[PDB]
Amino acid sequence: SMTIMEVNLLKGPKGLGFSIAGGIGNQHIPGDNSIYITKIIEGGAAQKDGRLQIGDRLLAVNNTNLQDVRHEEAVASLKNTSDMVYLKVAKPGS
């Protein structure tokens, strides 16, 4: 089974503060189109909160499922969010 966590972040003065890779046409692992968190930016909301980690797979932002999307669409979904943002992640499985 998947180890799933839900994290609600307030963007704040420095924003959510994490980078993502992966996506359709931009695979992080061969055969895997998942979106992966690759950096936690110093000073951002993700760092302050502490729950998100490099290596997490970003499953959804609010009501938008990101399990099989283009990287550009995943980035857009993160930017199309208001001050409180629901993030659902899978922790490393393997």
Side-chain angles (χ1 to χ4, degrees):
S1 285
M2 202 165 248
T3 300
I4 298 169
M5 286 179 70
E6 299 177 318
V7 175
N8 289 287
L9 296 181
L10 176 56
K11 287 194 160 185
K14 296 297 189 173
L16 296 178
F18 65 91
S19 306
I20 52 159
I24 293 169
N26 191 46
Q27 296 187 330
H28 185 67
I29 297 162
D32 187 352
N33 294 325
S34 298
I35 303 299
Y36 286 81
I37 299 184
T38 54
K39 197 195 271 185
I40 303 297
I41 308 301
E42 290 289 312
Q47 180 192 41
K48 175 182 171 183
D49 170 86
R51 290 177 287 178
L52 296 176
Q53 295 162 291
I54 294 176
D56 287 353
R57 277 164 289 160
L58 182 60
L59 303 177
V61 172
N62 294 336
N63 258 15
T64 303
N65 186 312
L66 300 179
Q67 290 181 265
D68 189 39
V69 298
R70 288 276 291 264
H71 185 263
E72 302 89 339
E73 289 157 356
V75 171
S77 181
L78 287 164
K79 306 302 170 177
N80 290 335
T81 60
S82 277
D83 69 329
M84 286 299 309
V85 185
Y86 169 91
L87 301 168
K88 182 167 63 182
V89 298
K91 311 303 282 192
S94 60

